[PDB]
Design a protein around this ligand. Structure first.
Ligand SMILES: [Mn+2]
Length: 123
């Protein structure tokens, strides 16, 4: 079986803990990051990891995070969670290299399938 880690980034702690807890209850190895900046500083050390990030985050957006990762010469399959009915954000996220976007609110089954898909990109 594959042993990958799901890295979660969200500006709202309650939403972050909700997702994290749900994925762990489903058997995924999960790591919650305090902010986009914290994940960016942790990124060089990631091995066999997938990223699930929120898009609208005041300090650093999900898109900007994706562009910074690219600058670090690092490729981490990413799923971007976008605001309800926010088309500009989903489009920009895909143009930025995200494996896929997920519109919230979302069904656990759906985010779980999106994560399994991103893991397809792990070498
Ligand atoms: Mn947000």
């Amino acid at each position: 079986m594959q042993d990958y880690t799901v890295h979660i980034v969200d500006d709202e702690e309650p939403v972050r803990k909700s997702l994290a807890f749900m994925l762990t209850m489903n058997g995924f190895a999960v790591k919650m990051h305090q902010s986009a900046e914290a994940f960016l500083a942790f990124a060089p050390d990631v091995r066999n990891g997938v990223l699930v990030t929120d898009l609208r985050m005041p300090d650093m957006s999900g898109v900007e995070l994706l562009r910074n990762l690219g600058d670090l010469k690092i490729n981490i399959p990413s799923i971007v969670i976008t605001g309800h009915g926010d088309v500009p954000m989903a489009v920009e996220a895909m143009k930025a290299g995200a494996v896929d976007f997920i519109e919230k609110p979302f069904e656990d089954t759906v985010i779980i399938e999106a994560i399994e898909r991103a893991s397809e990109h792990l070498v």
